[PDB]
């Protein structure tokens, strides 16, 4: 029995690479064994063991998805550049996963700083809160998909409180005012994501149907801070797969590190079976792509594009989209990146869950990732692609007011039917009729005080 890289080259017979591959193969077998000895449905355990025997003893050739030149380049990038991560807080660990957007196949990964010194696989084993990288999946993507907001929809960021009366905070700030979806995402403000998930619940939206299609296990959906990543912990590999679904215009493919297991007699025993699912519509996923493009361009929450410009100005011109997250004590940082072909997930942190430095996600993980991305391209010059993410033909563009995010028109501004007028903007929608006409409660969220204040500077013009 052996494991090969995608090209057929021998990995080994029966060091993260070996362990991660054998584990998956054994899981393959086990699922099957629950029907070879005919068989059916805490033992278990017998079958887990049975599987590891049947694998080590058989004369099986297991073919991985692992691209060999890419995977070793990624090993060399972490050896060469992991020191970029160090910030005077102890050993900063790292996990990464590179995934094919069309297939769900994993091409390479970083399991940690150095397997010799520390064996924890940070790509496939360790689970951490995804923090604000939860928002495009769980809040905004689904609200767009249910036809409840469009690209230029306005949301509340005015101060507001949880049900216990504690304030919703963003670092030391308590909120500001009305803002577009662009601005909410670029800065990653929390209160507008609070109100979006809260509106999804008021409408009875099946949020869990969406998350379980991308393979997400969340034990409790009834949690106010859920869209900021509370009550959620994920592996890097499972997280890259929610970003694969958005990059790939809304169609999930399941991650996998094995395509083919073959007998000693060359018969095809096991084959990866593709089960594509349209999680979000095409309108939705292509709208969210255009938003996440701006997250990386505006450079508010990450320096990644500047880093990549200076290392490889030609790769910096590829069509990068992405999103960041910080857990609320600086303990874990995330940076998720896609071109149309690939998606690289990244996590940093400490095994013992304690703070990182203040600019560890902003600057440190961003600069490391940008060295990682360039290393990947140096070893496979056309893998990232030159393609562009592009709005779907089904997208509905509406012409809306900047100030409201809805169509211009008449509104009763505290009784006194006003004529609402001013500069307009195109707004992309994933429904049938686009954006409504302006009503008085024009944002997602807000208290009457907020709208008194809102409306009386809109009126003032
Ligand atoms: Cl910058």
Cα–ligand 1 centroid distance for 325 (angstroms): 17
**Helix extents (H) in 351-417:** 366-378
Which of 308, 306, 303, 297 is CA-nearest to residue 378? Answer: 308
Cα–ligand 1 centroid distance for 344 (angstroms): 20
Calpha distance 201→250 (Å, rounded): 22
Cα–ligand 1 centroid distance for 330 (angstroms): 20
8 A C-beta contact, residue 120 and residue 93:
yes
Residues near 243 by beta carbon (within 8 Å), at least 6 away in sequence = 323, 336, 338, 343, 345
Which of 74, 98, 72, 68 is CA-nearest to residue 374? Answer: 74
8 A C-beta contact, residue 290 and residue 428:
yes
Alpha carbon of residue 377 to chain centroid: 22
Cα–ligand 1 centroid distance for 306 (angstroms): 5
Calpha distance 446→449 (Å, rounded): 8
Residues near 253 by beta carbon (within 8 Å), at least 6 away in sequence = 102, 103, 104, 244, 274, 275, 276
Calpha distance 402→435 (Å, rounded): 12
Cα–ligand 1 centroid distance for 445 (angstroms): 32
Cα–ligand 1 centroid distance for 310 (angstroms): 11
- 442-460 as b/e: b if 16+ CB within 10 A: bbbbbeeebbeebbeebee
For the chain, the maximum distance between any two Cα atoms, rounded to a whole number of angstroms, is 84
Calpha distance 341→373 (Å, rounded): 13
Cα–ligand 1 centroid distance for 303 (angstroms): 4
Which of 433, 371, 370 is CA-nearest to residue 397? Answer: 433
Residue 456, strand partner residues: none
Cα–ligand 1 centroid distance for 183 (angstroms): 17
Task: Give the number of residues written for the chain.
Answer: 461
Cα–Cα distances in angstroms (integers) from residue 379 to residues 131, 227, 375, in the given order: 32, 37, 7
Q: What is the CA radius of gyration of the chain?
A: 24
8 A C-beta contact, residue 377 and residue 342:
no
Cα–ligand 1 centroid distance for 366 (angstroms): 10
Cα–Cα distances in angstroms (integers) from residue 413 to residues 384, 445, 457, 460, in the given order: 52, 18, 12, 12
Residues near 96 by beta carbon (within 8 Å), at least 6 away in sequence = 74, 109, 110, 123, 236, 344, 345, 346, 347, 369, 372
3-state secondary structure at position 274: coil
End-to-end Cα, the chain, rounded Å: 75
- 247-282 as b/e: b if 16+ CB within 10 A: bbbbbbbbbbbbbbbbeeeeeebbebeeeeeebbbb
Sequential DSSP letters for 399-451: EEETTTSSB-EEE-TTSS-EEE---EEEEEESSSS-S-B--SS-SBS--HHHH
Residue 173, strand partner residues: 170
Write the DSSP symbol of residue 166.
-
> Entry resolution in angstroms?
2.4
Rounded to 10 degrees, the C-alpha dihedral 271/276/279/282 comes to: 150
Residue 403, burial from CB neighbour count under 10 angstroms (0-12, 13-18, 19+): buried
Residue 110, strand partner residues: 96
Residue 440, burial from CB neighbour count under 10 angstroms (0-12, 13-18, 19+): middle
8 A C-beta contact, residue 100 and residue 84:
no
Cα–ligand 1 centroid distance for 369 (angstroms): 14
Which of 20, 192, 36, 191 is CA-nearest to residue 107? Answer: 20
Cα–ligand 1 centroid distance for 168 (angstroms): 28
Calpha distance 64→54 (Å, rounded): 19
Residues near 92 by beta carbon (within 8 Å), at least 6 away in sequence = 85, 86, 113, 348, 349, 350, 356, 360, 364
Q: What share of the chain is helix, strand, coil (3-state, %, to 5)?
A: 35, 20, 45
CA atoms lying within 13 Å on the CB side of residue 234: 30
Query: Angle of helix 16-33 relative to helix 46-57, nearest 10 degrees?
Result: 120
Cα–ligand 1 centroid distance for 200 (angstroms): 35
Sequential DSSP letters for 168-230: --BTTB---SEEEHHHHHHHT-SHHHHHHHHHHHHTT--HHHHHHHTT---S----TTGGGTT
Calpha distance 352→350 (Å, rounded): 5
Calpha distance 98→107 (Å, rounded): 6
Residues near 241 by beta carbon (within 8 Å), at least 6 away in sequence = 99, 104, 214, 215, 252, 254, 255
8 A C-beta contact, residue 325 and residue 130:
yes
Which of 20, 22, 51 is CA-nearest to residue 34? Answer: 51
Cα–ligand 1 centroid distance for 298 (angstroms): 9
Cα–ligand 1 centroid distance for 375 (angstroms): 21
Cα–ligand 1 centroid distance for 316 (angstroms): 13
Three-state SS string across 300-345, please?
CCCCHHHHHHHHCHHHHCCCCEEEEEECCCCCEEEEEEECCCEEEE
């Amino acid at each position: 029995s052996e494991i090969t890289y995608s090209d057929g080259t021998v990995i080994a017979s029966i060091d993260y690479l070996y362990f991660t591959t054998l584990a998956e193969a054994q899981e393959r077998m086990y699922d099957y064994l629950a029907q070879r000895d005919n068989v059916s449905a805490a033992t278990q355990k017998f079958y887990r063991d049975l599987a590891a025997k049947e694998i080590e003893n058989g004369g099986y050739k297991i073919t991985t998805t692992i691209d060999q030149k890419i995977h070793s380049a990624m090993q060399s990038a972490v050896a060469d550049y992991g020191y970029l991560l160090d910030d005077g807080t102890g050993r900063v660990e790292v996990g990464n996963v590179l995934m094919d957007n069309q297939t769900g196949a994993i091409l390479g990964f970083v399991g940690g700083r150095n397997y010799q010194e520390n064996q924890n696989n940070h790509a496939f084993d360790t689970k951490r809160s995804p923090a604000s990288t939860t928002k495009p999946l769980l809040a905004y993507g689904i609200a767009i998909d249910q036809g409840l907001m469009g690209s230029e929809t306005i949301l509340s960021n005015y101060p507001t409180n949880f049900a216990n009366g504690n304030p919703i905070m963003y670092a030391n700030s308590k909120g500001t005012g009305m803002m577009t979806l662009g601005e909410a995402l670029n800065y990653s403000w929390n209160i507008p994501a609070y109100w979006t998930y809260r509106m999804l619940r008021e409408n009875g939206v099946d949020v869990k149907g969406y998350m379980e299609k991308m393979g997400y296990e969340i034990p409790e959906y009834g949690i106010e801070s859920l869209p900021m990543g509370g009550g959620i912990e994920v592996t890097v590999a499972q997280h890259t797969n929610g970003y694969q679904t958005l990059a790939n215009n809304g169609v999930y493919h399941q991650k996998h590190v094995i395509s083919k297991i073959e007998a000693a007699d060359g018969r095809v025993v096991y084959e990866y079976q593709d089960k594509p699912v349209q999680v979000y519509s095409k309108a939705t996923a292509t709208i969210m792509q255009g938003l996440l493009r701006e997250v990386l361009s505006s450079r508010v929450t990450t320096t990644f594009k500047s880093n990549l410009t200076s290392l490889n100005p030609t790769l910096a011109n590829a069509d990068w989209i992405g999103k960041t997250g910080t857990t609320n004590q600086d303990e874990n940082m995330w940076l998720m990146l896609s071109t149309p072909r690939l998606t690289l997930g990244g996590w940093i942190g400490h095994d013992d869950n304690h703070s990182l430095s203040q600019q560890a996600g902003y600057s440190n993980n961003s600069n490391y990732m940008a060295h990682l991305v360039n290393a990947i391209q140096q070893a496979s010059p056309s893998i990232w692609g030159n393609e562009r993410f592009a709005l779907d033909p089904s997208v509905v563009k509406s012409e809306v007011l900047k100030s409201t995010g809805q169509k211009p028109g008449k509104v009763s501004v505290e009784g006194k039917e006003v004529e609402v007028t001013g500069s307009t903007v195109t707004s992309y929608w994933a429904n049938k009729s686009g954006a409504p006409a302006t009503s008085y409660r024009f944002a997602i969220g807000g208290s009457d005080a907020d709208y008194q204040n809102a409306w009386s500077s809109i009126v003032g013009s």
